[PDB]
Amino acid sequence: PAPGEPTWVDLLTPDRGAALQFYSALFGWEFSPYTMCRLRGREVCSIGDLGENPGPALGGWSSYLSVDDADAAAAAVPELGGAVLLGPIDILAQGRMLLAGDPSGHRVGLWQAKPDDGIGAYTRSELLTGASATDGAFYRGLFGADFATRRAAIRQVGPAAPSGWYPCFRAQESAVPAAVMLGASVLLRYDCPDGPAVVVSAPGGEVFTLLLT
Template sequence: MKLTEPVPGGPCWVELSTSDVPAARAYYAGLFGWRCETDPRPEAGGYTTARVDEDAVAALSPLYQPGRPPAWTVSFAAEDADASADAVRDAGGTVLMEPMDIFDQGRFAVAADPSGAVFSLWQARAFPGAGRFNSPGALGWVELRTPDPQGALAFYPAALGWTADAQERFTHWGVDGADFGGLKEQDDDERAGTPPHWVPYFVVSDAETTAARALTTGGEPITPPARVPGGPWVATLRDPLGARFGIRTP
């Protein structure tokens, strides 16, 4: 990812909604070395921030809706969450949760693209988003898995102002040409069991070692570690509670 800090339109935060926050907290702390802090305020609902050193890198929270499967959600920075929500609707997406204030931290909305892939919008106030990218334990890439890549190529540039570098086998998303993520079409097998979704990739020093540790502590493989031609080593995994995520080398 060529972004080094949150910028309008780019990824700024990732949150795990899970059925067992203490178990997820222990799993990811063992995998990435996160230090987790739970907001003690009752109105925060158990919201837990994960840090690398002093930098916030991700969050874990109880399921927003009981019965929903655990999942990671990627948030994209918005200068005006209300205007961005309107742009999502105008481009053919759906606003699942209207913009609302989160204490003094910022303004937040939840949306879905036309294929149903869910993402969030974050208008920063006191909290700008992740304190670091592209280093071990921090976010290093995001990827959209969808059965409708052409629909995605029409939607996201219109809704969020992204650039799209569409190559033969892969498309890179960017902000003013600075790549931060990608687009992959779901194959028939994946479509049968998995709805369209965004996958966050966390940076690790060694993909094979981290993948092995992820499996021995209760996770499951989705795709094994492999070298992107001319690029990093990557793998996708499922945590013990079922949430999908990725790892990649710098």
């Protein structure tokens, strides 16, 4: 795909099984360290076990954006005011990846590779940030002046809102009360050109976004 295109998401959680029930209940996903989640016979995402390995680790949903050249991106990140957090490293033969932090400290994955659009599918990721101009300059240095203007987006939010990259999945409006009945908590609601977006704290604490149609 094009540079900067949302391309993959995965969830690291300490209670895998509980997460599989929740997302299958909410989205319909049919389902080693990880579990592959499918819908319409296509893979949507993966859910892996947080305590599979030691060391310090941040759980939650990780978003991966496409890059043509992981090594070049890795050289660009410090020059543009961010930091390389991991990599560049080869992932078997699937491709090459690095994890990066932008000027505000938000973590994002960058993926050099070597997709439905219905209910329950991964539509895009969106960055909520209090520094949309500073952060936007960083991403457009990596991906081009057209970036954020599958297509990612960057939203300016106030100091009390959640911040960082969040995966967005299409759903019907009924998904919000369903998520809440399953134990989730809404954190934020905002309008997008293609519908309202609802930022949800899952019962396990990870955060994702519902795009309502």
